[PDB]
Design a binder for this molecule. Structure first.
Ligand SMILES: [Cl-]
Ligand SMILES: [Cl-]
Ligand SMILES: [Cl-]
Ligand SMILES: [Cl-]
Lengths: 185, 185
């Protein structure tokens, strides 16, 4: 069934783009962003919880986040979890608010991240092209196995080459957007 | 952001590539009778949907022939429909409570093509695995340049992830040569 093969393309491609966005989303840029704390796991209330379910995070200025802790008994555990992530924030507190200052990014650190983000952008393109090559290889198998005609191969090839190109534009826009965050002040 | 999580990402993503390639080559006809070809067959009967192997028992009769013992002979039509709809290319005949499937004969030119395509599909899998390793290594390098982990930390993680890659590469290659042996008899 070609119908089942055309969905493996979009599924594998979307899943791959989804993996690469999550990977770059955490790359630090100098500017303070609440998502850097997305995935801080705090041990409280008998288990492990995401930081945003027991507090409220906000950007105070370019280099600072505020964390409003609703249960004051969670302040130490949150301070401990943030410190032990080794993200290296400046940590202090007043009453039920934790203040995080974002460490400065040096010039060399910023150039290394520009290069490493380019490499990851190409690792993404490679998986998208490799998915495409593999899907065509599968259709060539079906067409050689006399399961589909040649017309079925060219037609689905055009449709999938169109799906690949649209998915790739998302890849280039996402990695260009992240690069602009690195480059600007 | 923890090295342990990055390592688990490598494993999970390379096991997804391995699993996807195994299913790709499972769709390659070999000219020989193999019961695994009918594993996914879903049969509409008794007003619902059942796996083929809960209403029947598939055996290999000779090199080019499968025998399906249909316990409820009233299911023979529904099973024949299910198999023919999956477009697997079988010759089919009925007899009492039995369905004879003849494997479609494979020319030497088809076999030559499928060997070549198996090698391409296999190398696509290797490209995916190596790309994942490079991507994971780039993510570790981002963490090191961002001062979240040391250079020794990264090298230690790099060896462990080389171990994961070697182990999944070996399973890709063993599936490759085993599938080649089947294509060549
Ligand atoms: Cl600081
Ligand atoms: Cl650096
Ligand atoms: Cl894949
Ligand atoms: Cl590197």
């Amino acid at each position: 069934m070609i119908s089942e093969v055309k969905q493996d393309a979009k599924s594998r491609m979307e899943k791959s783009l989804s993996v690469y966005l999550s990977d770059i989303d955490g790359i630090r840029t100098g500017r303070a962003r609440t998502s850097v704390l997305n995935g801080i796991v705090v041990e409280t209330y008998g288990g492990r919880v995401k930081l945003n379910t027991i507090s409220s995070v906000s950007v105070s200025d370019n280099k600072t986040l505020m964390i409003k802790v609703w249960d004051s008994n969670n302040i130490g555990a949150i301070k401990t979890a943030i410190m032990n992530s080794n993200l290296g924030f400046g940590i202090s507190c007043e009453a039920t608010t934790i203040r995080l200052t974002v460490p400065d990014m040096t010039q060399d650190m910023r150039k290394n991240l520009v290069k490493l983000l380019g490499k990851i952008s190409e690792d993404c393109r490679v998986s998208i092209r490799n998915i495409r090559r593999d899907i065509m290889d599968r259709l060539k198998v079906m067409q050689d196995s006399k399961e589909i005609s040649e017309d079925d191969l060219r037609v689905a090839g055009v449709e999938i080459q169109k799906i690949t190109d649209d998915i790739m534009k998302k890849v280039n826009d996402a990695f260009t957007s992240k690069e602009k965050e690195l480059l600007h002040v």
